[PDB]
Design a protein around this ligand. Structure first.
Ligand code: CLA
Ligand code: CLA
Ligand code: CLA
Ligand code: CLA
Ligand code: CLA
Ligand code: CLA
Ligand code: CLA
Ligand SMILES: CCCCCCCCCCCCCCCCCC(=O)OC[C@H](CO[C@@H]1O[C@H](CO)[C@H](O)[C@H](O)[C@H]1O)OC(=O)CCCCCCCCCCCCCCCCC
Ligand SMILES: CC1=C(/C=C/C(C)=C/C=C/C(C)=C/C=C/C=C(C)/C=C/C=C(C)/C=C/C2=C(C)CCCC2(C)C)C(C)(C)CCC1
Ligand SMILES: CC1=C(/C=C/C(C)=C/C=C/C(C)=C\C=C\C=C(C)\C=C\C=C(C)\C=C\C2=C(C)CCCC2(C)C)C(C)(C)CCC1
Ligand SMILES: CC1=C(C/C=C(\C)CCC[C@H](C)CCC[C@H](C)CCCC(C)C)C(=O)c2ccccc2C1=O
Ligand code: SF4
Ligand code: SF4
Lengths: 34, 31, 75, 740, 141, 80, 61, 75, 31, 135
């Protein structure tokens, strides 16, 4: 009955992890601090 | 150096003799 | 003529326009670009102008004919 | 510097997109970072190994957790020859209802993927029987990866960073790796086999809750310490033993039978236990050879530099000068990395060659698609490791090699005549290629003109001799083990070749893949394989030995390993760097492995159907390969989806087309070169800066075309991803549409 | 020998192929004479003659005779080319004589080239076959 | 920038200075050759890296070398 | 080193390293590479002459 | 075959080929068979020209043989 | 058929441990 | 700077946003007569009789333009670097003499007092700031 975990993890791994990862890395590679 | 080349032709002759031994087992000369 | 014919005629439009892009780019930029100003001193047919300016391989008009032969083939 | 990447002040001052791309490509080259010392180099490498090792153990935990939770392992134990193993479940919101119906398979409840890696056969062989055991294995591997992650964190803290002398203390690491990491691990694996896997195969449960009580053999350690070791070999499993049941079951734990278990068609477990015990004793003894803190043992440095042979002066070991090779190995991380990649690539090919012909896991010899997937997987991994072996030989020669500390030794002698080596690899390459191609074209024309009896067909008489010396009676050669009157056959003095009846029973079955019958189709393909090996070696060896300099660029070591060219002058110098031989040789390595896996697959696909005659009659000319292997076997693949519907091969059809697309996208980066794209991007910059509302935004980093080396990288990456995915889609789908 | 090599004259698949033989030339019995000549080879179960190249004298015509024949003709060609390049390196413009052949130099050389093994052995023993490793160019190590 | 080096096998034939499209090179006085002049590269910040100087150099195995390095706006040849 | 002599190049970076060329002229002004050698082989730049030092030469007569 | 053989010329450059010719010219200098017309790898432009000529020749001859053998059989 | 839900949740909570340890190793390797 | 901008109807090839933000260049020359030349950005323009002033995106544009002003026998062309601070520096020729000619007062820069096969090995200079070409 733990098959509901896929409807959380696959949209997380497909949208939330890419958006957060790319947003951090975009702001990081364009920053002039570090 | 060594114009007879005795160390490197000893091992070349040994490898070729092992080759001839395998071929002697191939052509049914031995056994 | 139907949807498959619509699709393939736009494939044709695409592949001709890309071939025209390559060949027209080679004709309009045969003498100069922003990158290499004295390109017409180097000739029509020359390989490059060295690895500098980032790398300037296949800038000649000949090289555009080269690259456009493949897209002509594709089309 | 003051901006990403922080390891390169030269890249961080680049105002273009090239900053980002070369940051991504140089992040793992620790040596080229700003202010790298040698000690900090080895400390960082040592902690990243713990990280990578944790990545491996988290991967294995994924396999176990997903089979334990989503697979059908407990349903697969009951009938391994018929139930399809489930890899994992599919949650895709993109599927329509007929795709969900097509992928609801293997008796599962929703859409699932069929497993092709063979881990059910492996886990079943080693004693696992329930989903709970797979689950505790995966949780264990999570904690084990946690232990390596903490250890890698810990050895970066300032009191725990190991000194540079600790990293170069080679003889201690050899004693520990040979004795510990090989021998204790092998001895413990013999212990698992004997305590767990042999009783589970004989029907008796042994777990963590009863292994301190149940003895593996009824006699105990009493025969071991008394030296009556043959007690452990008495009463083996019979020829009517059924796996994981009690009928036909013996009590032996250490046999030397040979051949295969007749039900599961794989090697005997007591033979493997005895293998790992004897292997462990060998490696533990070998781990006492070298000198450490305790006075006894060998000094490898002294063994290199030695100049006397019982008072007679020699150049060195085998009269060959090895002075400075100890330092050349021990001081250069690229020498060690290229050397280990070579050894590991040989071992990966050797693993690949044995797991189809001498399989170990129960019933995997009848799971044909996993046999194809495993052999093709390890042969691709092997060719990549060999390309990297030579690539780090070339990086070693550029960066780490000084001729003054290798003065007069064997490596300098190799460098002194590199033209002879390269021209002889060229001779062997042309010699194989001309004749193997012309032979195929002879046979192909002659079959085309309707007279196929004029084919040049050559028996592989020497490899058929080797099969005959191994005891295969089919050729009728009456040599070493096929001759029952031979001294090899009877083993005359001792007569202790106790493996020989089981080995001869397996090799003369004709129902397995143990030394398959070969003929003239096997001959020509082995010479094509020799061609591919020799040409890939030619490119790699030539790039290594010319990495320092050549006549066209005498100062190539001043530019390093990877640089675009030396410009248009001196005739033109495209692909002159040592990196460019890596580039050019990945094509020949992929080609070579494509020839070997096409050959493996088409021969076995003949055997698996009962039609060896198709291969034996049609592989002597190239249209037989084309028609009967590429055309004939791709039929069911490209019908994975069609205008009428969809079946379970539609992922592999979609992947097949995908791989064609990635492979062909490569050719753009390989054929069109940089200055075209740079002139095109300049007009895109004009168009963006002259367009209204799009004027409101623009770039912080200036758009440029990819660099010359970058484009070679991207094109080769596309080429090989498309190569791998196209072949893996075809291999899986063509085998599994025929056999499941 | 290996993998079901019967003689061609006894193989039923060879006898079945010989009945449907195609004519190679304009001779109406090229196929029959082809199978009569091939009847003494060894034969797979598909009917096709397999060749044995291990060097036994029962099968010398499979590979040993063509080996001697090729190596003689190839040594002829290579020795004549070496003799021509060595003969023209003294005649005051060598590169022009490589695209425009001196027939008065080349044709006596191609007539002389029948005895290339004796000439090659006399070239070998006198130290004239090879140049020294210090005499010819190399690249920095 | 890139780095343009000059070695003492220079014969001062001025051809690299004529080949340069960005005025990196110049001829300075010397006593090491018959022409009594070397090449020198004071403006290497303007080096695009195109290696016309090395193509122009006549001495066998060049008296001038360009070592490509950190890329700037000038060395990438960008007009934007 | 005399004009007309057949020298052999000892310069390892040279195209004609361990090859035989002919001396064209030798300067006496004390420059670093005084000897001009002409070759029958052109290099990759199409040039068959180069300045050499005396230490980079051995005479072949 | 001719199509695939084009890709050796398209994907490579001439520094590799000139450096391989150096070792082969060594083996000819060793046996006194080096030609006075010195062997050079093809120029960058010629390598591109040969590559596109074989790519076009191979691809068009493939479609030629395909079209001929299908339409002489079904039509 | 499969494993229970509680075992899945225990495996996820245990996988929080090498995730935190991998974050700490990756940030320490960065400096 | 002084000079008349040459007569042409404009192009898309001219100065972009780099001119107002980091760097701009200019070439001046004096011509004996009005005559047609070719712009580095593409196109035909007419130079004026007398002094001229044409702005360019890169230094290489002015060196290509001054290379084709040699063909009209105009050899007094000067190139200026122009920063957005208004700071104009005179770059070519920098000495006043064209660099093909030797002028005194010029010092050697980046000369190596050795031949090029006498550079150190990269392993001999490893883990330090120096390269093999550096002195
Ligand atoms: C791997 C992760 C991933 C996941 C989980 C999804 C999930 C989804 N995609 Mg998507 N997609 C992905 C990657 C992914 N995509 C990539 C990489 C591509 C590029 C090839 C696409 C291209 C793609 C297209 C072109 C389309 C989808 C669509 C869809 C939806 C399927 C239709 C449906 O049931 O919703 C029905 C839709 C709804 C119930 C309304 C949308 C609800 C979402 C969650 C928006 C809520 C946002 C909220 C306000 C904050 C679904 C939400 C379709 C769709 O419906 O998109 C809107 C569609 O048209 N996808
Ligand atoms: C086995 C894989 C592996 C490992 C162990 C490393 C390890 C490392 N890389 Mg690396 N890298 C890899 C693959 C890998 N790389 C690949 C495939 C690429 C190509 C995209 C790169 C590109 C790359 C760049 C560009 C850089 C590194 C850097 C680093 C170092 C700092 C780690 C860091 O900042 O993590 C940060 C990551 C996280 C915090 C995420 C952890 C999230 C978990 C899941 C929770 C470390 C030595 C950096 C470096 O050396 O600078 C000192 C650096 O700048 N890497
Ligand atoms: C007995 C003591 C001992 C042990 C067990 C180890 C173990 C290890 N050391 Mg270590 N080391 C030791 C002492 C020891 N060391 C000492 C004393 C020193 C100092 C002189 C070092 C210095 C040292 C350094 C500097 C490094 C290591 C590294 C490693 C790791 C090697 C990589 C690996 O996992 O290979 C695993 C190897 C095996 C399992 C055996 C070989 C595998 C073969 C080739 C495969 C074939 C077997 C079989 C057929 C396959 C079955 C497959 C099937 C199950 C699927 C490993 C964890 C490296 C590392 O990763 O550190 C984090 C590293 O860089 N060691
Ligand atoms: C034990 C294994 C091992 C180790 C430790 C190293 C270590 C190293 N190698 Mg190396 N190498 C290896 C194996 C290894 N290699 C193998 C097997 C090969 C043959 C392929 C090579 C070939 C090689 C070359 C040619 C070079 C290195 C370089 C390097 C150094 C830097 C790597 C770097 O920063 O690249 C950064 C890494 C990346 C940017 C990752 C590239 C990503 C690739 C293309 C995979 C992409 C696949 C893609 C995601 C698939 C998606 C498909 C999907 C759509 C389905 C580093 C010292 C380089 C160096 O600096 O040496 C001086 C260098 O020039 N190696
Ligand atoms: C089908 C494609 C193909 C073919 C045939 C070859 C053939 C060859 N490559 Mg390869 N190559 C290819 C693709 C191919 N390559 C690709 C895609 C790459 C990646 C860029 C490379 C990269 C590469 C490198 C980097 C190297 C080679 C090498 C070689 C040679 C290996 C020696 C050999 O087998 O001799 C056999 C010769 C042949 C098979 C070709 C001759 C064909 C017939 C016999 C000639 C008859 C022609 C006929 C008379 C018609 C006349 C034409 C007229 C009518 C117009 C050979 C010339 C190596 C080399 O030079 O070795 C010395 C080497 O270093 N190649
Ligand atoms: C299969 C191989 C292949 C492909 C895909 C391309 C693709 C392209 N080439 Mg090309 N090229 C190739 C081979 C190929 N080439 C070869 C072999 C050569 C050698 C001669 C060249 C030489 C060449 C030149 C000289 C030129 C091009 C141009 C172009 C572009 C055409 C215009 C355009 O944008 O179309 C649109 C793009 C496509 C149709 C590509 C497919 C896009 C997919 C269908 C959509 C994306 C899917 C999805 C949303 C992605 C999500 C991913 C996920 C991670 C979320 C395009 C990027 C021209 C160009 O740049 O003009 C603008 C141009 O001038 N190419
Ligand atoms: C005078 C003719 C001649 C001779 C004696 C040799 C001799 C040799 N060549 Mg060769 N070669 C030649 C011409 C010749 N070459 C030409 C014209 C080419 C350009 C195609 C090459 C290209 C070549 C390569 C690429 C390689 C050799 C290699 C070799 C060596 C091994 C044998 C071999 O691989 O042959 C193979 C040679 C060929 C396939 C070339 C074809 C030969 C032509 C068709 C015959 C030439 C005859 C001549 C034109 C007639 C003039 C006669 C006069 C009366 C006018 C050997 C020293 C190999 C080596 O270094 O190994 C150590 C090697 O890798 N050769
Ligand atoms: C048994 C292994 C043979 C060891 C012979 C050995 O030590 O060679 C060592 C000596 C090498 O001879 C040493 O060489 C040095 C450098 O060449 C110096 O010249 C020394 O003066 C000379 O003694 O080999 C021989 O004397 C030749 C023996 C031939 C052996 C061939 C083995 C054939 C295989 C059977
Ligand atoms: C059959 C048999 C046998 C035998 C075996 C053998 C003897 C084997 C061997 C094998 C071998 C013998 C192998 C080989 C391999 C090797 C390789 C593969 C190598 C390579 C390497 C590399 C890659 C290198 C690199 C480099 C360079 C290039 C430079 C410098 C650095 C280096 C060194 C790193 C016996 C008796 C047991 C028994 C019976 C069976
Ligand atoms: C018997 C037999 C066999 C075997 C074989 C063998 C194994 C051999 C080997 C051999 C060898 C291993 C050889 C080697 C050699 C080497 C060398 C060293 C060479 C050299 C050469 C030369 C030098 C040449 C010269 C010339 C001439 C003479 C003429 C022309 C020109 C030239 C120059 C080319 C077989 C099975 C196949 C078949 C059957 C029989
Ligand atoms: C393979 C390859 C070569 C090697 C090819 C060469 C050197 C030319 C091919 C050899 C010619 C065909 C040999 C001709 C020799 C004689 C004319 C043969 C005479 C024989 C008689 C019987 C006629 C390049 O030079 C090259 C250059 C630039 C980019 C890519 C490549 C490239 O891919
Ligand atoms: S790689 Fe490009 S820039 Fe370099 S020599 Fe070749 S064509 Fe020219
Ligand atoms: S690389 Fe180009 S810009 Fe630099 S000095 Fe040479 S010719 Fe001038």
């Amino acid at each position: 009955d733990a098959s509901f975990l896929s409807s959380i993890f696959v949209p997380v791994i497909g949208w939330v992890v890419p958006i957060a990862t790319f947003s951090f890395l975009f702001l990081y590679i364009e920053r002039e601090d570090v | 150096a060594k114009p007879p080349y005795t160390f490197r032709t000893g091992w070349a002759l040994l490898l070729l003799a092992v080759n001839f031994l395998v071929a002697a087992y191939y052509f049914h000369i031995i056994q | 003529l139907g949807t498959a014919d619509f699709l393939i005629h736009h494939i044709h439009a695409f592949t001709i326009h890309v071939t025209v892009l390559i060949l027209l780019k080679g004709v309009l930029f045969a003498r100069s670009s922003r990158l290499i100003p004295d390109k017409a001193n180097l000739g029509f047919r020359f390989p490059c102008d060295g690895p500098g300016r980032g790398g300037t391989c296949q800038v000649s008009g000949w090289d555009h004919v080269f690259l456009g032969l493949f897209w002509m083939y594709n089309s | 510097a003051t901006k990403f990447p922080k390891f390169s002040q030269d890249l961080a001052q680049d105002p273009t997109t090239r900053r980002i791309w070369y940051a991504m490509a140089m992040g793992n080259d620790f040596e080229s970072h700003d202010g790298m010392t040698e000690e900090n180099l080895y400390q960082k490498i040592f902690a990243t190994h713990f990280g990578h090792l944790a990545i491996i153990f988290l991967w294995a935990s994924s396999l176990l957790f997903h089979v334990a939770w989503q697979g059908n392992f407990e349903q697969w134990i009951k009938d391994p020859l018929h139930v399809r193993p489930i890899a994992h479940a599919i949650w895709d919101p993109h599927f329509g209802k007929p795709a969900i119906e097509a992928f609801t398979q293997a008796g599962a409840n929703g859409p699932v993927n069929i497993a092709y890696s063979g881990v059910y056969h492996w886990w079943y062989t080693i004693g696992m029987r329930t989903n709970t055991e797979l689950y505790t294995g995966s949780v264990f591997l999570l904690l084990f990866a946690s232990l390596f992650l903490f250890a890698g964190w810990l050895h970066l803290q300032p009191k725990f960073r190991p000194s540079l002398a600790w990293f170069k203390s080679a003889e201690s690491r050899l004693n520990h790796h040979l004795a510990g990491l090989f021998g204790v691990s092998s001895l413990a694996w013999a212990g698992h086999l004997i305590h767990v896997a042999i009783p589970e195969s004989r029907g008796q449960h042994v777990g963590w809750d009863n292994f301190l009580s149940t003895a593996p053999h009824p006699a105990g350690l009493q025969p071991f310490f008394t030296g009556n070791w043959g007690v452990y070999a008495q009463n083996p499993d019979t020829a009517g033993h059924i796996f994981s049941t009690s009928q036909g079951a013996g009590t032996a734990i250490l046999t030397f039978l040979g051949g295969f278990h007749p039900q599961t068609e794989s090697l005997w477990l007591t033979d493997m236990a005895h293998h790992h015990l004897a292997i462990a004793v060998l490696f533990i003894v070998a781990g006492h050879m070298y000198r450490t803190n305790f006075g006894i043992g060998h000094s490898i440095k002294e063994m290199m530099n030695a100049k006397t042979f019982f008072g007679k002066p020699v150049e060195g070991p085998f009269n060959m000068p090895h002075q400075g090779i100890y330092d050349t190995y021990n001081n250069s991380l690229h020498f060690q990395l290229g050397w280990h990649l070579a050894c590991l690539g040989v071992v990966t090919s050797w693993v690949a060659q044995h797991m189809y012909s001498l399989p170990s896991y129960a019933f995997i010899a009848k799971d044909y698609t996993t046999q194809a997937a495993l052999y093709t997987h390890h042969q691709y991994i092997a060719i990549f490791l060999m390309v990297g072996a030579f690539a780090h030989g070339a990086i070693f020669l550029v960066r780490d090699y000084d001729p003054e500390q290798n003065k007069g030794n064997v490596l300098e002698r190799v460098l002194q005549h590199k033209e002879a080596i390269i021209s002889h690899l060229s001779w062997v390459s042309l010699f194989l290629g001309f004749h193997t191609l012309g032979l195929y074209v002879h046979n192909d024309v002659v079959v085309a003109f309707g007279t196929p009896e004029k084919q040049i067909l050559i028996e592989p008489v020497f490899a058929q001799f080797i099969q005959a010396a191994h005891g295969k009676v089919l050729y009728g050669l009456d040599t070493l083990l096929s001759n029952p009157d031979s001294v090899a056959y009877t083993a005359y003095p001792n007569y202790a070749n106790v493996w020989l009846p089981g080995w001869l029973d397996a090799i003369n079955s004709g129902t397995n893949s143990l030394f398959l019958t070969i003929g003239p189709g096997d001959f020509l393909v082995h010479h094509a394989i020799a061609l591919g090996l020799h040409t890939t070696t030619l490119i790699l060896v030539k790039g290594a030995l010319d990495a320092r300099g050549s006549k066209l660029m005498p100062d190539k070591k001043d530019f390093g390993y990877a640089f675009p060219c030396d410009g248009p002058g001196r005739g033109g110098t495209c692909d002159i760097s040592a990196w460019d031989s890596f580039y050019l040789s990945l094509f020949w390595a992929l080609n070579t492995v494509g020839w070997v896996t096409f050959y493996w697959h088409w021969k076995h696909l003949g055997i698996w159907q009962g039609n060896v005659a198709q291969f034996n009659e049609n592989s002597t000319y190239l249209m037989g390969w084309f028609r009967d292997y590429l055309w004939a076997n791709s039929a069911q693949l490209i019908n994975g989806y069609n205008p009428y519907g969809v079946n379970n091969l539609s992922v592999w059809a979609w992947m097949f087309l995908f791989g064609h697309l990635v492979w062909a996208t490569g050719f753009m980066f390989l054929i069109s070169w940089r200055g075209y794209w740079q002139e095109l991007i300049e007009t895109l910059v004009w168009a963006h800066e002259r367009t209204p509302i799009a004027n409101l935004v623009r770039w912080k980093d200036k758009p440029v075309a990819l660099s010359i080396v970058q484009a070679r990288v991207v094109g080769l990456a596309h080429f090989t991803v498309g190569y791998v995915l196209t072949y893996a889609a075809f291999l899986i789908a063509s085998t599994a549409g025929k056999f499941g | 020998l290996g993998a079901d090599l019967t003689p061609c004259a006894e193989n039923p698949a060879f006898q079945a192929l010989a009945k449907n033989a195609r004519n190679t030339t304009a001779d109406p019995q090229s196929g029959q004479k082809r199978f009569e000549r091939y009847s003494q080879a060894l034969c797979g179960p598909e009917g096709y003659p397999h060749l044995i190249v291990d060097g036994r004298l029962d099968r010398a015509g499979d590979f040993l005779i063509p080996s001697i024949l090729f190596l003689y003709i190839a040594g002829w060609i290579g020795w004549v080319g070496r003799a021509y390049l060595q003969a023209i390196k003294k005649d005051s413009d060598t590169e022009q004589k490589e695209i425009q052949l001196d027939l008065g130099i080349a044709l006596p050389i191609i007539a002389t080239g029948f005895a290339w093994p004796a000439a090659a052995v006399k070239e070998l023993l006198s130290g004239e076959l090879t140049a020294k490793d210090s005499e010819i160019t190399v690249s920095p190590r | 920038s890139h780095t343009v080096k000059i070695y003492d096998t220079c014969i001062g034939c001025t051809q690299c200075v004529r080949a340069c499209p960005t005025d990196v090179l110049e001829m300075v006085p010397w006593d090491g050759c018959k022409a009594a002049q070397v090449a020198s590269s004071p403006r290497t910040e303007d080096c695009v890296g195109c290696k016309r100087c090395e193509t122009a150099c006549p001495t066998d195995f060049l008296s001038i070398r360009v070592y490509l390095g950190a890329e700037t706006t000038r060395s990438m040849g960008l007009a934007y | 080193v005399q004009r007309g002599s057949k020298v052999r190049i000892l310069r390892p970076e040279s195209y004609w390293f361990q090859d035989v060329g002919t001396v064209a002229s030798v300067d006496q002004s004390g420059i670093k590479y005084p000897v001009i050698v002409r070759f029958d082989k052109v290099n990759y730049a199409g040039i068959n002459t180069n300045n050499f030092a005396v230490d980079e030469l051995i005479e072949v007569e | 075959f001719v199509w695939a053989f084009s890709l050796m010329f398209l994907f490579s450059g001439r520094g590799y080929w000139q450096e391989l010719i150096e070792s082969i010219v060594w083996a000819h200098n060793k046996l006194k068979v080096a030609p006075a017309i010195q062997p050079r790898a093809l120029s960058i432009t010629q390598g591109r020209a040969v590559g596109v000529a074989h790519y076009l020749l191979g691809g068009i001859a493939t479609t030629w043989a395909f079209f001929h053998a299908h339409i002489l059989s079904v039509g | 058929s499969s494993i229970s839900d509680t075992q899945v949740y225990i495996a996820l909570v245990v996988a929080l441990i090498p995730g935190l340890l991998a974050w700490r190793l990756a940030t320490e390797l960065y400096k | 700077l002084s000079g008349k901008t040459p007569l042409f109807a404009g192009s898309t090839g001219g100065l972009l946003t780099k001119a107002v933000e980091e760097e701009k260049y200019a070439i001046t020359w004096t011509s004996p007569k009005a005559q047609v030349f070719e712009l580095p950005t593409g196109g035909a323009a007419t130079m004026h009789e007398g002094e001229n002033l044409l702005y360019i995106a890169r230094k290489e544009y002015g060196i290509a333009l001054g290379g084709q002003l040699r063909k009209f026998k105009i050899t007094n062309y000067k190139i200026y670097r122009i920063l957005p601070s208004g700071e104009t520096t005179f770059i070519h020729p920098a000495d006043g003499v064209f660099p093909e000619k030797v002028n005194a007062g010029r010092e050697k820069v980046r000369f190596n007092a050795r031949s090029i096969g006498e550079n150190p090995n990269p392993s001999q200079v490893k883990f330090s700031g120096k390269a093999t070409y550096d002195a």
